Design a protein around this nucleic acid. Structure first.
Ligand SMILES: [Mg+2]
Ligand SMILES: [Zn+2]
Lengths: 315, 139, 515
RNA sequence: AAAUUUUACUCAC
RNA sequence: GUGAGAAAGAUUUGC
C-alpha cells in the first residue's frame, strides 16, 4: 500500500529543478517602537487634512433625497419624466434609457457632502433603490418619495442594445427640496434632481440593507449622541441629533463600506494600551483606498464620529 | 449518443460520488442577486403556490417545548450536545416509506454541536437553540 | 453610531463592500508585492526556525477523501487548443471529471497512486504524463473576493488546477492532523469562541497580551517554507511536486500570463504556514495571519519579535497592538478571565435576501446573540418583530405572493407576526418550521438552489441520480445502465407508494415526533 | 452622462 | 426566452 511519505523515482530530479530555480533573499529586520495610541489631536489632524484636500459640496446631492420634497405623487412623476426628456434620454417600450458613446476615462470630482438635517425617508429610499434597480426604466413611487432608475447603454446605431443585462449600470434619479444648482422646474413644480451612477452589484448592496433594524441594534447599548453641525462638528447650540440618522444612511449608500474599516481600527484603538509608532495612525488614512464622493463623505464622517466620541465621551 | 459517454468520455464506470456531484441542486448560497432571481419569472410566487397545496399538507405536527428550569447569567462556556444519527434499520424503514434517500443518508451520521452559552442551571443541563436564557432544556 | 457604543463593536451590522471592478488591479498588486518580498527589500520570506519538533507522518497510508474533491465552486482547467495553453473556468466537479477522463482513472486516489508510481516523468498516464500534469497545475485564474468587511479595496483570490487541488487536499489534511497533535486548540471540533477561551487560559499567567496580525501573509510564505514544513512532517514526493508547482505558478490576468515565483496565492496552505510558525516555538497561538501571545518584560517582547521574524510571520505595525485587560483572537474579544467582552462584538446584520431566508437568518443571529449574552431575550423579541415588519414592508406585494391565509407571515400576505419565543419552542403553524434555524430549508432557498443548478457552469444533461438507498456506498462504481436501473426502481417504488416526488426529511422534526 | 478601462460579445432556434 | 462558441454570463468568487 502506498504511503504519504512515498518517494517517487523522480524526486531527485524535481528537487534539483527546485534548487536551480530562484530563491528569496533575507529581508530587513524591522524596528518596532511601542507608544501610546493616538489622541484627539491626531484624529482632528486627519479630519482637517481631508477637509483641506477635498473641500465640501454646495449641497448634499443624494443624501438630500432622504428628506421629503414638497411635491405630491403626480407632480413627482411629471418632474422625473420631464427631467428624463430634458436630458435627451431615449424612450423605448415605455421606458427611459441613457445612451453613451465616448468616455473621458477620468475620475469624477470628489468632495465631501454636507449633512442634511434628517433622513426620515431612509427606509423608503433604500427599498426604492432596490426595486428600481431590479426593474428599471419607469418611475417608481413610495408613500412619500419617487425614484427613476435608467439603464445606461452603449449607442451603436441601428443594432444598439435594447434590453439591459446583468452587467448594465443604472443612473438612479431622485428628488429633493429645491435650492441648489440641480434645480429643475416644469409647470410651476420645482425640485432638485440628483443622480447616482451605480453598477448592479452596488445597487443591490445598497438596497438590501435594513435601516430600522440596524438603528435599533446600535441603539441597544449606545451612549448619548451629541448634536452636530452640517459639517459634522460638535454644535450644542445650533446642532441636531437627527443628523446621526443621516450618517447611518450615508453608510448604507456607500457600497465600499469604508466606515467598517474605520470602525475596526477604532475598536483596536479603544482596546489598545500601546501601538506601533507612526504605523497605527496610518490605519486611519483611507483616502487612497476609496474613490468617489459618497465613499469620501462616509470616510470623513466616520472620522468625525471617532473625533466626537474622543471629545464628549473620552475613554 | 448518451450523455454518460460525453461527460465521462474514455471511462465506462464512475463512482456514485462523482455522478451525484455532477447533478447538485440542494446547495444554497446567500448572494446579492437574490431578490432579482426570486422575481424573475415569478419563480418564488409559483414556488409558494406549489408549497401551499402540495408540500405544506405533509409536514407532521411537532410538539412544542415545555420543560424549562431556572437559570442565572454565568461565565461564557461551550455547550456540547451530541445528537446521534439514525440506526441502520431506521434508515431502511424511512427509505421504504418514501422519504428522500439523500436526507436519510445525511442523518445516518452522528454529530455533535458546539455552541457558546452564557447561562447555567443548578444541575448543569443542556439547553435548546436560543433558549438558554429562558431555561428550556434538551432533557 | 458604532463609535458611541459602551462596549466593543466592529461595525459588522451592514454588509461588506462590493463592486463590479475587475480583479486585474488587485492581482497585479499582489504579484508585485510578492516579487518585491522575493527581492528581499520589503519583508522576510526566508525561514530560519527549527522544525525538528514536528512528528513525521511519512508512514501513514495515503488516504484521499473524494467528497471534498468534488464541489460546485470554481476552478481552472487547462487545455491545449492548437499549441497554446487555454485556461477555462469550470466547477471543481467538472474539472476533476475532466482530469480523470484525461488520465483514465476511476477515482482520484487511483490517479494519485498511479502518479506516485511511475518510472519517469515522461511515462504516460492515460493521455497525459506527470510532466504535463505538473506543467498544467501551475496555472491559476484570478477573481475578486468581495464583501470582506473592513476592506474597501477588494482582495484577489485565485482558482487553481484540479491536480493542484488533489495534492493540496492530502498536504493540508496531514498538516491539520499534525497541528491537532501539536496543541489542543487546533482540534477539529472546536468553535471560534472555544479557541478564544483556550487562548485566554493559555496567556493568563503573563501580564501583557500582544494581539498581532501578519501583513502580506500570503506573499511572504515561500515555496521553500512550504517544502521545509512538508519535509518536516514527511509528505514525501507529494510535497516536492506541490512546491515545484507553487514556485513555477502563473496567473492569468485579463488575457496575459504573469509569473509569480513568490508567495502561495491567497491562503492555499493556511495550515502549512500555521505549522511553519508553531513547529519552531510554543509561545504563540496562531491561526494563519492572526496570532496572540503573552509577555512580561521588554526582553520577552523582543524574543517574540525574533520568533515571528524567523518564521516569516511579519508583524503588522498597522493593526497589531498590546493590551492588558482584553484578548482578541479569531475576531472574538474576551476579558483576561475568559468571559465575553460586553458589547455587540462581531454581531452581523442580516440583509434582505428572500422573504423567508431573511427571517430564518435573523432568527439564527438572534439565537446566537442571546445564547452568548450579547443582548437580553426581550430585546431579541423586539428585534425579531421589527424584522418581520420590515420584511412585510419589503415583500408583501403581488410580485412575491398572491395569498391571504391567516397563518402566513405578513410578508407573504398573511396576518401572523410570530413571537420569537413561540418560534423557538416550535409553538407555531407548521409553515413556520422552515423559519426555525434548525428547521427545514425555506421556499426561497430551494428555488435558488434549483436555479443555481440550472446555471451555465453547472447545467448538465446527465440523468440525475438522487434519492439513493442509504446502504449503497458512494465509492461504488456504476455505469449508465446501472443508474438507469436504480432510477427506474426508485421511481416504480415511489409511484407504488403514491408519492410523485420523495418526501422531504428533517432530523429535528422526525426526532421530536417520535415517542 | 457618472462612485469612469466599467456601463461591451457572437451564432442558431 | 432557449442551445453552443469567445481564457467569459451572473451559485459570479477561491482556500
Ligand atoms: Mg489580530
Ligand atoms: Zn444639489
Amino acid at each position: 500500500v502506498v504511503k504519504v511519505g512515498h518517494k517517487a523515482s523522480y524526486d531527485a530530479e524535481l528537487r534539483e529543478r527546485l534548487l536551480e530555480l530562484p530563491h528569496p533573499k533575507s529581508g530587513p529586520k524591522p524596528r518596532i517602537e511601542w507608544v501610546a495610541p493616538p489622541r484627539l489631536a491626531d484624529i482632528s489632524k486627519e479630519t482637517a487634512e481631508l477637509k483641506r484636500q477635498y473641500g465640501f459640496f454646495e449641497c448634499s446631492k443624494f443624501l438630500a433625497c432622504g428628506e421629503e420634497c414638497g411635491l405630491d405623487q403626480e407632480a413627482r412623476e411629471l418632474i422625473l419624466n420631464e427631467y428624463a426628456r430634458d436630458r435627451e434620454f431615449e424612450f423605448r417600450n415605455g421606458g427611459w434609457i441613457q445612451r453613451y458613446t465616448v468616455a473621458s476615462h477620468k475620475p469624477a470630482t470628489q468632495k465631501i457632502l454636507p449633512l442634511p438635517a434628517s433622513a426620515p425617508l431612509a427606509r423608503e429610499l433604500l427599498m426604492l433603490i432596490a426595486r428600481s434597480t431590479t426593474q428599471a426604466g419607469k418611475v417608481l413611487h413610495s408613500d412619500n418619495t419617487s425614484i427613476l432608475a435608467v439603464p445606461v447603454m452603449r449607442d451603436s446605431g441601428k443594432h444598439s442594445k435594447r434590453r439591459p443585462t446583468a452587467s448594465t449600470h443604472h443612473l438612479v434619479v431622485g428628488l429633493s427640496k429645491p435650492g441648489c444648482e440641480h434645480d429643475f422646474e416644469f409647470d410651476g413644480y420645482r425640485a432638485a434632481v440628483h443622480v447616482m451612477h451605480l453598477d448592479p452589484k452596488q445597487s443591490a448592496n445598497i438596497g438590501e440593507q435594513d435601516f430600522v433594524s440596524t438603528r435599533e441594534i446600535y441603539k441597544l447599548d449606545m451612549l448619548e449622541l451629541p448634536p452636530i453641525s452640517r459639517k459634522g462638528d460638535l454644535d450644542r447650540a445650533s446642532g441636531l441629533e437627527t443628523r446621526w440618522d443621516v450618517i447611518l444612511l450615508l453608510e448604507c449608500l456607500d457600497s465600499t463600506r469604508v466606515s467598517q474599516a474605520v470602525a475596526q481600527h477604532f475598536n483596536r484603538h479603544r482596546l489598545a494600551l500601546s501601538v506601533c509608532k507612526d504605523e497605527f495612525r496610518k490605519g486611519y488614512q483611507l483616502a487612497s483606498e476609496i474613490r468617489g464622493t459618497i465613499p469620501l463623505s462616509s470616510l470623513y464622517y466616520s472620522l468625525c464620529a471617532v473625533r466626537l466620541r474622543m471629545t464628549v465621551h473620552p475613554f | 449518443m448518451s450523455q454518460f459517454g460525453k461527460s465521462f468520455k474514455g471511462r465506462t464506470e464512475v463512482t456514485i460520488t462523482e455522478y451525484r456531484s455532477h447533478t447538485v441542486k440542494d446547495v444554497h448560497r446567500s448572494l446579492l442577486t437574490a431578490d432579482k432571481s426570486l422575481r424573475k419569472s415569478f419563480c418564488f410566487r409559483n414556488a409558494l403556490n406549489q408549497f401551499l397545496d402540495k408540500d405544506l399538507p405533509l409536514l407532521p405536527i411537532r410538539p412544542k417545548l415545555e420543560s424549562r428550569v431556572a437559570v442565572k447569567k454565568s461565565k461564557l462556556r461551550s455547550q456540547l450536545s451530541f445528537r446521534p444519527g439514525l440506526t441502520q434499520e431506521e434508515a431502511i424503514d424511512l427509505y421504504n416509506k418514501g422519504y428522500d434517500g439523500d436526507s436519510v443518508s445525511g442523518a445516518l451520521q452522528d454529530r455533535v454541536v458546539n455552541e457558546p452559552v452564557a447561562y447555567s442551571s443548578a444541575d448543569n443541563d443542556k439547553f435548546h437553540r436560543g433558549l438558554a436564557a429562558l431555561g428550556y432544556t434538551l432533557a | 453610531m458604532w463609535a458611541f457604543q459602551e462596549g466593543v463593536c466592529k461595525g459588522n451590522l451592514l454588509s461588506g463592500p462590493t463592486s463590479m471592478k475587475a480583479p486585474d488591479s488587485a492581482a497585479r498588486e499582489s504579484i508585485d508585492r510578492a516579487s518585491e518580498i522575493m527581492t528581499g527589500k520589503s519583508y522576510n520570506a526566508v525561514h530560519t526556525g527549527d522544525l525538528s519538533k514536528l512528528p513525521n507522518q511519512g508512514e501513514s497510508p495515503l488516504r484521499i477523501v473524494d467528497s471534498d474533491l468534488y464541489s460546485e465552486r470554481s476552478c481552472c482547467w487547462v487545455i491545449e487548443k492548437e499549441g497554446r495553453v487555454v485556461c477555462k473556468s469550470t466547477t471543481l466537479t467538472r474539472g476533476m471529471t475532466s482530469l480523470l477522463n484525461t488520465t483514465k482513472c476511476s477515482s482520484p486516489s487511483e490517479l494519485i497512486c498511479k502518479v506516485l508510481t511511475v518510472e519517469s516523468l515522461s511515462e504516460k498516464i492515460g493521455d497525459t504524463s506527470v510532466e504535463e500534469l505538473l506543467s498544467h497545475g501551475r496555472y491559476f485564474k484570478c477573481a475578486l473576493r468581495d464583501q470582506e468587511r473592513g476592506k474597501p479595496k477588494s482582495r484577489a483570490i485565485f482558482l487553481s488546477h484540479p491536480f493542484f487541488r488533489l495534492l493540496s487536499s492530502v498536504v493540508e489534511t496531514h498538516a491539520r492532523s499534525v497541528l491537532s497533535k501539536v496543541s489542543a486548540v487546533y482540534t477539529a471540533t472546536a468553535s471560534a469562541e472555544q479557541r478564544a477561551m483556550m487562548a485566554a487560559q493559555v496567556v493568563e499567567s503573563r501580564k501583557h497580551v500582544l494581539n498581532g496580525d501578519c501583513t502580506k501573509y500570503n506573499e511572504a510564505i515561500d515555496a521553500d517554507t512550504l517544502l521545509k514544513v512538508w519535509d518536516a512532517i514527511g509528505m514525501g514526493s507529494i510535497g516536492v511536486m506541490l512546491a515545484y508547482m507553487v514556485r513555477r505558478k502563473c496567473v492569468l490576468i485579463k488575457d496575459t500570463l504573469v509569473e509569480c515565483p513568490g508567495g502561495m496565492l491567497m491562503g492555499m496552505f493556511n495550515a502549512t504556514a500555521t505549522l511553519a510558525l508553531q513547529g519552531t516555538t510554543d509561545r504563540f497561538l496562531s491561526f494563519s495571519d492572526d496570532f496572540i501571545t503573552s509577555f512580561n518584560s521588554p526582553a520577552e517582547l523582543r524574543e517574540i519579535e525574533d520568533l515571528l521574524f524567523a518564521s516569516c510571520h511579519n508583524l503588522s505595525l498597522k493593526k497589531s497592538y498590546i493590551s492588558v485587560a482584553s484578548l482578541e483572537i479569531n475576531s472574538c474579544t474576551l476579558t483576561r478571565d475568559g468571559d465575553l467582552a460586553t458589547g455587540l462584538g462581531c454581531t452581523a446584520g442580516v440583509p434582505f435576501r428572500g422573504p423567508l431566508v431573511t427571517l430564518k437568518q435573523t432568527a439564527a443571529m438572534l439565537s446566537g446573540a442571546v445564547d452568548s449574552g450579547v443582548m437580553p431575550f426581550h430585546s431579541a423579541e423586539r428585534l425579531f418583530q421589527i424584522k418581520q415588519q420590515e420584511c412585510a414592508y419589503r415583500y408583501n406585494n403581488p410580485t412575491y405572493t398572491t395569498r391571504n391565509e391567516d397563518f402566513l407571515p405578513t410578508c407573504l400576505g398573511g396576518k401572523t407576526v410570530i413571537s420569537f419565543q413561540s418560534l423557538l419552542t416550535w409553538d407555531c403553524h407548521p409553515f413556520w418550521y422552515q423559519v426555525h434555524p434548525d428547521g427545514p430549508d425555506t421556499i426561497d432557498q430551494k428555488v435558488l438552489s434549483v436555479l443555481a443548478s440550472k446555471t451555465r457552469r453547472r447545467r448538465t444533461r446527465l440523468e440525475a441520480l438522487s434519492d439513493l438507498d442509504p446502504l449503497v456506498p458512494h465509492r461504488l462504481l456504476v455505469s449508465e445502465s446501472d443508474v438507469s436501473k436504480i432510477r427506474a426502481a426508485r421511481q416504480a417504488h415511489l409511484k407504488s407508494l403514491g408519492l410523485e416526488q420523495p418526501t422531504n426529511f428533517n432530523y429535528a422534526i422526525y426526532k421530536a415526533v417520535q415517542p
